[PDB]
Amino acid sequence: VQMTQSPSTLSASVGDRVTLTCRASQSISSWLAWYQQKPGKAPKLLIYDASSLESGVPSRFSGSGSGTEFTLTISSLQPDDFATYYCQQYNSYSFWTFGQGTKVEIKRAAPSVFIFPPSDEQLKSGTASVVCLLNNFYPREVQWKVDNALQSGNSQESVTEQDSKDSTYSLSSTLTLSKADYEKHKVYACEVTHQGSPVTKSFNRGE
Amino acid sequence: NPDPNANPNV
Amino acid sequence: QVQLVESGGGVVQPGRSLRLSCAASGFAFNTYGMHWVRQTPGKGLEWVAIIWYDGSQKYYADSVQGRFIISRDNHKNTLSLQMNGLRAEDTAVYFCVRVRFSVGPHGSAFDLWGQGTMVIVSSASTKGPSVFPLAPSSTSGGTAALGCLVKDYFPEPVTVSWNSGALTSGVHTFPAVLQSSGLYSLSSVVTVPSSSLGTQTYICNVNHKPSNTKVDKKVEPKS
Numbered sequence A: 001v002q003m004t005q006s007p008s009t010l011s012a013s014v015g016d017r018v019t020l021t022c023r024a025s026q027s028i029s030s031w032l033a034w035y036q037q038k039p040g041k042a043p044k045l046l047i048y049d050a051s052s053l054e055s056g057v058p059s060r061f062s063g064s065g066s067g068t069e070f071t072l073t074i075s076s077l078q079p080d081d082f083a084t085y086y087c088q089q090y091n092s093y094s095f096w097t098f099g100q101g102t103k104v105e106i107k108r109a110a111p112s113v114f115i116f117p118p119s120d121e122q123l124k125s126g127t128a129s130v131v132c133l134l135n136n137f138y139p140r141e142v143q144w145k146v147d148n149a150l151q152s153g154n155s156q157e158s159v160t161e162q163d164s165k166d167s168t169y170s171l172s173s174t175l176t177l178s179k180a181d182y183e184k185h186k187v188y189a190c191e192v193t194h195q196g197s198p199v200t201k202s203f204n205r206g207e
Numbered sequence B: 001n002p003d004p005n006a007n008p009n010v
Numbered sequence C: 001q002v003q004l005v006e007s008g009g010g011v012v013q014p015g016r017s018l019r020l021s022c023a024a025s026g027f028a029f030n031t032y033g034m035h036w037v038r039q040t041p042g043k044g045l046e047w048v049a050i051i052w053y054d055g056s057q058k059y060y061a062d063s064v065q066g067r068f069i070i071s072r073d074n075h076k077n078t079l080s081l082q083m084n085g086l087r088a089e090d091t092a093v094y095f096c097v098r099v100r101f102s103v104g105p106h107g108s109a110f111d112l113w114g115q116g117t118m119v120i121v122s123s124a125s126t127k128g129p130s131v132f133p134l135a136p137s138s139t140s141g142g143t144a145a146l147g148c149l150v151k152d153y154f155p156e157p158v159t160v161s162w163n164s165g166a167l168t169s170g171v172h173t174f175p176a177v178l179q180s181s182g183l184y185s186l187s188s189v190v191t192v193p194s195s196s197l198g199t200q201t202y203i204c205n206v207n208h209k210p211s212n213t214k215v216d217k218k219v220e221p222k223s
Helices: A120-124
Strands: A003-006 A009-012 A018-024 A032-037 A044-048 A061-066 A069-074 A084-089 A102-106 A112-116 A127-135 A143-146 A155-159 A170-178 A187-193 A198-204 C003-007 C018-025 C034-040 C044-051 C058-060 C068-073 C078-083 C092-099 C110-113 C117-121 C130-134 C144-153 C159-162 C171-173 C184-192 C202-208 C213-219
Touching (some): A018 A032, A143 A170, A155 C184, C003 C092, C144 C202, C144 C213, C159 C171
Antiparallel strands (some): A003 A018, A127 A170, A155 A170, C068 C078, C092 C110, C171 C184
8 A cells, every 4th residue: 555645744823623535555454653753863653543642642632534544633733833733554464554644834934946056166076056946935745847858767855943042944946967978968946836836946057 | 465554574 | 661772783884793682671572473663764764574473483674685584582572683795775774663562463653662762874984074064155044154064974963063152043053974985975055145245254163072083174155
């Protein structure tokens, strides 16, 4: 079974009602589990059997659903609820599979996108890294297009974490190519789709 | 071969 | 109270072997079925293996089938995982997981997790970082963005500051990613006002204690 969680990341505020949808490719009856994982911490079980609360979990967390569609509901969000939630199937011979997870973050501010051409120093090293910066703004998974051609495998993505300093977060997608494979292309673009709304920062090699 | 997700406890 | 503690993780050469341990306390270890679940930030969590409470039935994921050997010791309340022929994709935070005590024919969810142990499968030796500039070129969002590209260093970690610790607002040091080369790489970007590009100097400070290397890099806009 393949567990798909939508949205990949969701913004919310304190006191909001949050409903995270979990979908299974096959039917898993009601053998689904919900988890909460803070950054750098072990996963913490919240709901088992897709509708049964785990001991110690506050009543604000509720779960429902059966078959292929499941939902995790938080009646009122709390400051210690901002984390990443995972749904996992354990039905029949299908062993144990988690979803990609849904990260619940705090809002806020200006969403901006930057793209950095590979530095001249790195070009002497034989490497060409194009870095696409996302600030206070999240995708629904950031795509790469070189000479109007979608890339795959050569990109690597990372995300920061919000802190008490500010609710600012960032995501960086880095396209690593060789110098030989970088002089052969001119237009390098970075398209990030958010809503209905892709922004495509680009640049031509040299200038 | 039975179900691997069978009860693994006592 | 109930807890699990992992041990034995570290950096392992590819193709070699590494055995991970899990110490149990508080609960009756012999009465519970155990698990190994690893996790990488790029792909999420992934189940590895399960061992029955009596050690009768043992199962492994397809990606680890035949290369991993799960075992347990009910005498010492320890859960172990022998990993053989370790590939680079095995790099993940390994957790030993306990199922929930269920009565019936079917298993249950995961009600117990350890703090996790980190294993890094790479052939790389100690290497100093190569810091490359991310020059600003007016830009949007009300300000301008610039940063440093800490690339090709091993092993973790590296500490990044800006302007010798003065610049901290807007500094976003991204978590490192293990590249296909076996080395680590990260980017540390800071959003600064567009006016101060020609006035204020921006120098990042990357320190790699394992390699005893301290690289500073002055990022300036490109004309």
